[PDB]
Each structure stands twice: as C-alpha cells, then as structure tokens.
Amino acid sequence: KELLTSRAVIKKDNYAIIPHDGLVQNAVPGFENVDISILGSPKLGATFVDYIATFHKNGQQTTGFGGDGIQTLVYVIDGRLRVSDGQETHELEAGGYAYFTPEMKMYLANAQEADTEVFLYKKRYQPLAGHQPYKVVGSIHDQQPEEYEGMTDVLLWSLLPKEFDFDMNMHILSFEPGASHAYIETHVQEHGAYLISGQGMYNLDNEWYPVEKGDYIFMSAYVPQAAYAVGREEPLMYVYSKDANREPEL
C-alpha cells in the first residue's frame, strides 16, 4: 500500500480543493444503485449543496430530489440520464442539463446500462417581487459560447437565463492551454466548481495550486480567485454554480 498522502486543501468559509481520491460514498435518501458523494455544503461554508455521482445500471433517485423551496439542477458529464418531475420527462446526453424550480421534485434514472456521471446541485430559492423562476432544460452542444471577458482563448457557457427570474446560474468555462482569467476576482458570489477536463494552476486566496479533472473546488464569498490553464492534451474545463441577481439578506 502507498504512503498516506493527499492534495486536498480544506479551509472552511475560505476555499477547498477536494480531489476525487479522498471521497467516500454517502447514503443519500432516494438514490439506488448510485455512487454519490456530497461535495460543497453549508458545513464547508457553501450556501448550497452539490454532489458528484456515478449512476450504475438501474441507478435512480426515486423519492424526488429537490422541492419544498429548494431548486435543483443536474448536469450530465458523461452517459445518458432520464430526468422527470412526475409529469414531463427529459432524456439528457453528455452536456445536457435540467434546472427544476423550487416547487418541483426531480426524479432520476440512468438512461443506459453503462455508468453515467452527473453533477448535482441544489439551493434554497430566494424570492424577488415581480419575478419567478421557470424550468430550463438544454444542452451545451446547442449553445454558442461567449468569449469570456472578450478573450478569444476562453469560452463561457451559461445554462440559465441571465434574468432576475433566477437567483443563480450554472456555467462551463473552457480555457486553451496557457489562457487565463483577465484578473483575480473578489466578489460576494460563491462558486461550487467541478473540473471535467484538463489541468490548471488555480489561485485561491492568493495561493496557487495545481488542479485537474476530477477535482472539486469550493470558492467562498470574496476569496481571491483566478486560474491559468495548464497541460496540452486537452483544455481546462469546469462546470460551476453561483448565486446571483439578489441582495444579501440581513
């Protein structure tokens, strides 16, 4: 057996790098034939809960995932997934996703026999007079990404409408080798990020760390952050969430 080592970095209410190697299976109610690990959550300092899961043959969520004030979003990293609210159902392929409102529960089922990798997220919805969220189902493959911050070597996908009807959004960033954010950011919004491709050097609280596909990164409110894409076999890509379009409550 190899020496016990880990590149995990956990700094509550600051930031966290959670490599795939240190995860364990959590028994999440409703999930069957699914290996699922809880990643970001309130105890880490996040105001949401996200998960990484591998649906096996006959893998499914049978009791209804979100609901009762909690909105949800699932993103298919690889494979095929069936998502339903009990009335309408959708078949999602890699790159596909579904956002359910805080009133509807999400039921899931692997759409193939082979394993399907999915990223799950939930957040209690914060209402705003005159606005209301609505169900969104789509695929990154049917969307034209934007040049992030006007840069040609960094592409940004936005899964939800940039409207006040929503109190959050989910994005996918893709960097060409050597590319990077235009500057180190410090903002109130949080991020729950899961790397799905490549490698990078990530600045977290002004400390730089090598990161890679399979790594989960939690960025608390205000933590200095930015990254350089590194490696040349594939682009650095990660899906990440963020609270948005609302004001902090006192």
Automatic annotation (TrEMBL):
InterPro entries: Cupin_2, RmlC-like_jellyroll, RmlC_Cupin_sf, UGHY, UGlyAH_cupin_C, UGlyAH_Cupin_dom, UGlyAH_cupin_N. Pfam families: Cupin_2 (PF07883), Cupin_3 (PF05899). It comes from the Bacteria. CDD domains: cupin_UGlyAH_C, cupin_UGlyAH_N. Residues 173-238 form the Cupin type-2 domain. Residues 47-125 form the (S)-ureidoglycine aminohydrolase cupin domain. PANTHER family: (S)-UREIDOGLYCINE AMINOHYDROLASE. This is (S)-ureidoglycine aminohydrolase.
